[PDB]
Amino acid sequence: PLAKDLLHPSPEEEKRKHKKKRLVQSPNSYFMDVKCPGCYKITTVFSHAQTVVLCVGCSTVLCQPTGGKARLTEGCSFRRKQ
Amino acid sequence: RAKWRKKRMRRLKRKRRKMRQRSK
Amino acid sequence: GRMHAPGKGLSQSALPYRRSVPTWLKLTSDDVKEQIYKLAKKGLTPSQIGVILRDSHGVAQVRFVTGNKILRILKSKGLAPDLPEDLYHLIKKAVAVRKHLERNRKDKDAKFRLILIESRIHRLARYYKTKRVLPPNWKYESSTASALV
Amino acid sequence: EDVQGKNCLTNFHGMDLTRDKMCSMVKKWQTMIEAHVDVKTTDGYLLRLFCVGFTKKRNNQIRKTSYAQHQQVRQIRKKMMEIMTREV
Amino acid sequence: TKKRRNNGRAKKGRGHVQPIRCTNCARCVPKDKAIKKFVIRNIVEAAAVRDISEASVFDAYVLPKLYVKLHYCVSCAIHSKVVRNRSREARKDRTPPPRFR
Amino acid sequence: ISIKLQEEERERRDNYVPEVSALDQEIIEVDPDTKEMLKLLDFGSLSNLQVTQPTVGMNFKTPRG
RNA sequence: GCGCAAGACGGACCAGAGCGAAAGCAUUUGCCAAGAAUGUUUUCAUUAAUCAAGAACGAAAGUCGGAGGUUCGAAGACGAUCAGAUACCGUCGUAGUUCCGACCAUAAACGAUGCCGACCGGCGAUGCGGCGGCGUUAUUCCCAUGACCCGCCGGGCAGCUUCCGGGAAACCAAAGUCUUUGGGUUCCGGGGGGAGUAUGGUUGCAAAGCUGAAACUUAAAGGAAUUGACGGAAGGGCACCACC
Ligand SMILES: [Zn+2]
């Protein structure tokens, strides 16, 4: 060390740090776009959702809250938004 | 030992309570 | 660190640099406010409304969408309550700790926690009275508190 | 219970392990889990059954200790308590 | 002056530790300060095994053992030569004595 | 002691090299991770190499206690 | 040996492990309220740090009334040892030790080290929460879920190492960032005794707690480390002026 470049840390260095301790703060969460296996509507869900998210009319549970990221039910797929 | 001397100095005070009162 | 605890935890939220609404969220400001009014009439506090919106409708921040905050929106429409939510939840906990304390007279530790809770209540009440949110004659009564809750 | 002409006839009265067995089983860096149930049999006998069990180390484990968390031993005790009841 | 960094104990991050009685004195010692030994011995010594198997009615009988946990105060572990004194630097060696060799 | 005749004898012992060295091998066994390092070293055209299967169980520590 | 009862106590698992503001906390199950840490693209928006007065809790012992009294056991009565023993050892044994309700506010209550905040070296572990990754196992499968394995992040109890720097040194990653002397704030010390004593005030049923001098006396008392001498401290070696 003793000559570490504090201005330009590598992407592998910054992704390993705590979110508040990075050079600029950034969340580790995202919005993911979930599809019910039976229903056709496509629903946006927070990665760390605290509420049991369910379809408005198709009456199907999409996820269950846990201590970290919410857990999707079996048969439901997703993909990160942008 | 200071513990014993502390005990000794307390008996003297307890007796002087009796031998030195407001009624004296 | 914590006010009434020796802890020094660091967990919190980290807002992104982007103050801008993403392109995939197509909800207009007026439609976002309509959900705020709708959920305000089901007895939801602003902090509950925020998590509901975040988890379901893709609304990360309403200050970023509508350019205002939830409590200000509710107060402008007239849906804000009498006591602020943080002071409301502190008085509710004081009644619960005090209600447990008549069936349990030898519970010496709830007696310590109640002192801490009421100290926190007094701190918030002082702050709000300096801000002209509570009337200057407002005072927290340990017996009458249930009337506020 | 009876003496039928120079022979005395016996019935089941209890059961237990040996002190040597128990003391050999009790080791340090693991966890002990115990339970007790009262169950009455169909024919009218009331019994109290005690059960013991110890946490096991894995084949590739590198750590020294194999302790179980408190809610993990309340589940195990709950399972000991129901299997002993149904089988008596 | 201070001799040991751990004050002769194992207490860290707690206030009170329940006491126990020395096996030899019946003296109250904190559990983290007492000198503890687990002894697994044989009931019969090697001076009696040859006279025990010849009288045993079971072929290949394995004789039982005896398990005792012993607690000592600092004074008895030294008098009974369970624990010795050692130099200032050697005091920092906390590896068990090479008995397992 | 030190005899210069013994020095000469030990130098004759030291001046020993086999006809075929130990470092010229027809095949050199190389891990998949070393192959990528050689790729970064523009040595992907080596013909004496043979990538091998690495060990699967990640058990390289001594048990504690 | 088979039963019955009484009160006390929760062994082994039990660890330089966990929780609590500190005293302190260990059999199962249920109820009641509480709490840290982690997770968070929730909410309020300076609401904060330390604190005269004033308050809550505070080991053990001790004091007042009720209940009960297994064990242990101040006092006391004995038996030994001894030159003497009013002790150490032994046999009994009162108050007490236990519970309920009021007092008492003291400990080597110690990390002998106030609290809040920033910066300053490494390494392996451990407890909790989260995140990722080959592969074993819950018997042969669906996924989650558990038990292992390899890492990363945050908050904890600690450990090893270092010419970071400090110190009288012992030693301390804090006891560092101090003549290159200022982040905020509370309490408290000024050679050794007299003396935490007298006196006044105050609290308490009492025992006592808190506050707290002076006259006089004295050239040292004291802290770290070093060579010896000695030890009714532990290990080795030698000698027919030692033994066998
Ligand atoms: Zn002893």
UniProtKB/Swiss-Prot annotation, chain A:
Pfam families referenced in this protein's UniProt entry, alphabetically: Ribosomal_S27e
Q: State the residue spans of region: Disordered.
A: 1-22
Keywords assigned by UniProt, alphabetized: Cytoplasm, Diamond-Blackfan anemia, Metal-binding, Nucleus, Phosphoprotein, Ribonucleoprotein, Ribosomal protein, Zinc, Zinc-finger
User: Where is it made, tissue-wise?
Assistant: Expressed in a wide variety of actively proliferating cells and tumor tissues.
What compartments host this protein? Cytoplasm; Nucleus, Nucleolus
Q: Provide ranges: composition bias, Basic and acidic residues.
A: 1-15
* Major site of localization recorded for this protein: cytoplasm
User: Could you tell me which residues carry Phosphoserine?
Assistant: 10
InterPro entries attached to this UniProt entry: Ribosomal_eS27 (IPR000592), Ribosomal_eS27_Zn-bd_dom_sf (IPR023407), Ribosomal_zn-bd (IPR011332)
**Which GO terms of type biological process are on file?**
cytoplasmic translation; ribosomal small subunit assembly; ribosomal small subunit biogenesis; rRNA processing; translation
Q: Does the keyword Metal-binding apply?
A: yes
Indicate which residues the UniProt annotation says bind Zn(2+). Answer: 36, 39, 55, 58
State where the C4-type zinc fingers lie: 36-58
According to its UniProt record, which protein family does this protein belong to? Belongs to the eukaryotic ribosomal protein eS27 family.
What does the record note on quaternary structure?
Component of the small ribosomal subunit. Part of the small subunit (SSU) processome, composed of more than 70 proteins and the RNA chaperone small nucleolar RNA (snoRNA) U3.
Q: Know the name of this protein?
A: Small ribosomal subunit protein eS27
Write down the species.
Homo sapiens (Human)
Curated annotation (Swiss-Prot), chain B:
Q: So which domain of life are we looking at?
A: Eukaryota
Query: Where do the coiled-coil regions begin and end?
Result: none
The main location class comes to: cytoplasm
Q: Provide a Gene Ontology MF annotation, just one.
A: structural constituent of ribosome
Region called Disordered, residue ranges: 1-24
Mind listing the UniProt keywords for this protein, alphabetically? Cytoplasm, Ribonucleoprotein, Ribosomal protein
Q: Please, what other remarks does the record include?
A: Initially thought to be part of the large ribosomal subunit. Crystal structures show eS32/eL41 to be a small ribosomal subunit forming a bridge at the interface of the 2 subunits.
Which family does the record claim for this protein?
A: Belongs to the eukaryotic ribosomal protein eS32 family.
Q: How does it assemble?
A: Component of the small ribosomal subunit.
Q: What does this protein do?
A: Component of the small ribosomal subunit. The ribosome is a large ribonucleoprotein complex responsible for the synthesis of proteins in the cell. Interacts with the beta subunit of protein kinase CKII and stimulates phosphorylation of DNA topoisomerase II alpha by CKII.
This protein's name: Small ribosomal subunit protein eS32
Q: Which gene encodes it?
A: RPL41
Swiss-Prot record, chain D:
**What gene name is listed for this protein?**
RPS3A
Q: How is it modified after translation?
A: ADP-ribosylated at Tyr-67 by PARP1 in presence of HPF1.
Q: What is this protein called?
A: Small ribosomal subunit protein eS1
Its organism's taxonomic lineage begins at: Eukaryota, Metazoa, Chordata, Craniata, Vertebrata
Species of origin: Homo sapiens (Human)
> What's the stated role of this polypeptide?
Component of the small ribosomal subunit. The ribosome is a large ribonucleoprotein complex responsible for the synthesis of proteins in the cell. Part of the small subunit (SSU) processome, first precursor of the small eukaryotic ribosomal subunit. During the assembly of the SSU processome in the nucleolus, many ribosome biogenesis factors, an RNA chaperone and ribosomal proteins associate with the nascent pre-rRNA and work in concert to generate RNA folding, modifications, rearrangements and cleavage as well as targeted degradation of pre-ribosomal RNA by the RNA exosome.
Compartment(s) where it occurs, according to its Swiss-Prot or TrEMBL record: Cytoplasm; Nucleus; Nucleus, Nucleolus
Record's family? Belongs to the eukaryotic ribosomal protein eS1 family.
Please give the residue positions where the record annotates the modification ADP-ribosyltyrosine. 67
From Swiss-Prot, chain F:
Q: Where is this cross-link: Glycyl lysine isopeptide (Lys-Gly) (interchain with G-Cter in SUMO1)?
A: 35
Judging by the UniProt lineage, the source's domain of life is Eukaryota
Which residues are recorded with the post-translational modification Phosphoserine? Answer: 45
Annotated crosslink Glycyl lysine isopeptide (Lys-Gly) (interchain with G-Cter in SUMO2) location: 35
Where is the protein found, in the record's own terms?
Cytoplasm; Nucleus, Nucleolus
Reproduce the UniProt comment on modification after translation.
Ubiquitinated at Lys-35 by RNF14 and RNF25 in response to ribosome collisions (ribosome stalling).
The chain residues annotated with the modification Phosphothreonine are: 62
Q: Give the record's family classification.
A: Belongs to the eukaryotic ribosomal protein eS17 family.
Clinical disorder: Diamond-Blackfan anemia 4: A form of Diamond-Blackfan anemia, a congenital non-regenerative hypoplastic anemia that usually presents early in infancy. Diamond-Blackfan anemia is characterized by a moderate to severe macrocytic anemia, erythroblastopenia, and an increased risk of developing leukemia. 30 to 40% of Diamond-Blackfan anemia patients present with short stature and congenital anomalies, the most frequent being craniofacial (Pierre-Robin syndrome and cleft palate), thumb and urogenital anomalies.
**What assembly does the database describe for this protein?**
Component of the small ribosomal subunit. Part of the small subunit (SSU) processome, composed of more than 70 proteins and the RNA chaperone small nucleolar RNA (snoRNA) U3.
Q: What is this protein called in UniProt? A: Small ribosomal subunit protein eS17
Source organism per entry reads Homo sapiens
The upper taxonomy is:
Eukaryota, Metazoa, Chordata, Craniata, Vertebrata
Encoding gene per record: RPS17
Q: Which residues of the full protein are shown?
A: 69 to 133 of 135
